[PDB]
Amino acid sequence: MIINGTSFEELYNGLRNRGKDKKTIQLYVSPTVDAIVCYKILSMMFEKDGLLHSAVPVNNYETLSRVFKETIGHTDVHTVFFIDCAGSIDVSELLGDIENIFVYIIDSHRPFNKLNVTNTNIGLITSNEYVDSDGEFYSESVGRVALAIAKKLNKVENDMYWYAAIGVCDQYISLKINAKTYVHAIQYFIDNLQLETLEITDLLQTVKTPMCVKMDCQLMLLRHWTLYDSLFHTREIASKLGIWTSRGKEKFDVLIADMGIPLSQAQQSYKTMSLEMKNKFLLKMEGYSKFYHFENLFLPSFFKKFGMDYSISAFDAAHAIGSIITNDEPDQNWQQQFWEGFKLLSSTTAEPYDFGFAKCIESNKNLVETGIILLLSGSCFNEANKYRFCSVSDELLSIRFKTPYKALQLAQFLAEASSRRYKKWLPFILAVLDAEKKTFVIVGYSSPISVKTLNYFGAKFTQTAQNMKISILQKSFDSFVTEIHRENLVKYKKALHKCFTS
């Protein structure tokens, strides 16, 4: 059933009543920054009311189902929340015995599964006041729904708007919402906090509010990086400027010179680059944005002051947290990285964000450098407008990306970079030589832009593995990892193509 604002009071009274009996709340969190925001906002309310709760970071529905089965009937869990997952699948079919517990779902995927909607024992939470998935697009941020609960119940703390801003910035960064939807969300925060949108030239040193909004130039981590490298690594802008082509760095340097900015200025920290150079950059970029049609580069940013530092926007924070929760070492996993992301989100100081900024910067420098090479040199093809396939067997690149957690990051980058280059979004299958094991690591990745065909991509990718009798080493909600013998690359490509023809 659909739960809206008129039912939030009854819902929370139930949590309170069941919480007196020593029972607990279990929140299953899928791996998005928005999902962490939702958990955080709910957890703030729960803490204030003494409601025991726990987090279950889930990476796929198999894990969700296994923990649920191990939990129900074996502990004091009386209520479960599924955050940014489960809304668009047949939950009753997945989990079965569900009707003894209180099951709530806060998920941005739409449409909801019809059997979820008609089941009186499944609470699909929306903010209104009036494994096949049915998902076809993304709606309201899950953090925004948690904020809506707090507002309806008179439990809002104004810090929740910072978290909610990070959540909707995550949706926009992740390509789940468009710029108009993002701006409308910010306007909601402006209205409820009675803020004014400050000008892009405002450095915020005189603002009297602990949070604020100003027009901004949305180059990735610009204030925490350099003009030169922030511009080169902002994917939509780099694609439209054509600076990732052959000799793209020579063309880039020509662009920087066209702005009248020396490299000694463009390549130092943006915070120490002179204001005169910043003014030149802004004016030139305004013109470039109309010529190359990236006017959506200029969007309002939501800021929170940390001590004397007002340089961290909700976009900066979403980039930093998104990087922290990306697995990038062999011992990193979502169960642990969820808590690292929660800890950073919860920071009341600026210094913790430096680690996230650094991880994001380093990853993007590595991915863009490798990715440019592969799109120029690699064996990358579009197979029947079903998927792009690329295989890498060069000694140096292969050794660097043969591990699944690295290959997954490269596949995600290439999925976006190739789609922007050819103005055609497809899921991406990447094969990387593991020369020591005599195998290719195979990663399949589907970006949020391709969510409407994720059912088919996952089904056929997994059916190919089944036909080849190779193992799915890992799966997430939007990606898969398998591995083949090196000598079978052609055999595997033929099987994949056949499957994706069925």
Q: Which residues bind Cl ion (CB under 5 A)?
A: 179-180, 363, 366
Closest to Cl ion by CB, 15 or 392: 392
Closest to Cl ion by CB, 273 or 375: 375
Closest to Cl ion by CB, 8 or 225: 225
Question: Does residue 349 contact residue 306 with C-beta atoms inside 8 Å?
Answer: yes
Question: How far, in Å, CA of 209 to CA of 41, rounded?
Answer: 21
Closest to Cl ion by CB, 102 or 225: 225
Closest CA to 325 of 347, 317, 273, 385: 317
Residue 169 beta carbon to Cl ion: minimum distance, rounded to whole angstroms:
10
Q: Residue written as tokens 């949590």?
A: 15
Residue 96: CB atoms within 10 A of its CB come to 12
Torsion-angle region of residue 73: left (phi > 0), alpha (psi -120 to 50) or beta? left
Residue 295 beta carbon to Cl ion: minimum distance, rounded to whole angstroms:
8
CA 195 to chain centre: 27
Question: Does residue 256 contact residue 263 with C-beta atoms inside 8 Å?
Answer: yes
> Does 300 sit behind a cis peptide bond, omega within 30 degrees of 0 on the bond before it?
no
Residue 59 beta carbon to Cl ion: minimum distance, rounded to whole angstroms:
19
Residues 6+ apart with CB under 8 A from 189: 161, 164, 165, 195, 213, 302
Residue 406 beta carbon to Cl ion: minimum distance, rounded to whole angstroms:
6
Residue 340 beta carbon to Cl ion: minimum distance, rounded to whole angstroms:
17
Residue 293 beta carbon to Cl ion: minimum distance, rounded to whole angstroms:
13
Question: How far, in Å, CA of 172 to CA of 39, rounded?
Answer: 19
Residue 495 beta carbon to Cl ion: minimum distance, rounded to whole angstroms:
30
Tell whether the torsion through CA atoms of 226, 231, 233 and 236 is positive or negative. positive
User: Which helix (H) or strand (E) is 71 found in, with range?
Assistant: helix 61-71
Alpha carbon separation from 488 to 400, 472, 493 (Å, rounded): 22, 16, 8
Closest to Cl ion by CB, 209 or 366: 366
Closest to Cl ion by CB, 179 or 373: 179
Tell whether the torsion through CA atoms of 276, 282, 286 and 288 is positive or negative. positive
Which amino acid, 116?
A: N
Closest to Cl ion by CB, 180 or 208: 180
Question: Does residue 171 contact residue 161 with C-beta atoms inside 8 Å?
Answer: no
Tell me the chain's radius of gyration from C-alpha atoms. Answer: 23
Residue 371 beta carbon to Cl ion: minimum distance, rounded to whole angstroms:
10
Question: How far, in Å, CA of 417 to CA of 67, rounded?
Answer: 36
Closest to Cl ion by CB, 366 or 462: 366
Residue 86 beta carbon to Cl ion: minimum distance, rounded to whole angstroms:
27
The two three-digit tokens of residue 277, written as one number? 């150079």
Classify 424 as helix, strand or coil: coil
Torsion angles phi and psi, residue 480, rounded to 5:
-140, 150
Interhelix angle 142-152/159-173, rounded to 10 degrees, is: 160
Closest to Cl ion by CB, 65 or 366: 366
Residue 37 beta carbon to Cl ion: minimum distance, rounded to whole angstroms:
18
Residue 326 beta carbon to Cl ion: minimum distance, rounded to whole angstroms:
8
Closest to Cl ion by CB, 311 or 323: 323
Classify 155 as helix, strand or coil: coil
Question: How far, in Å, CA of 304 to CA of 317, rounded?
Answer: 10
Closest to Cl ion by CB, 180 or 247: 180
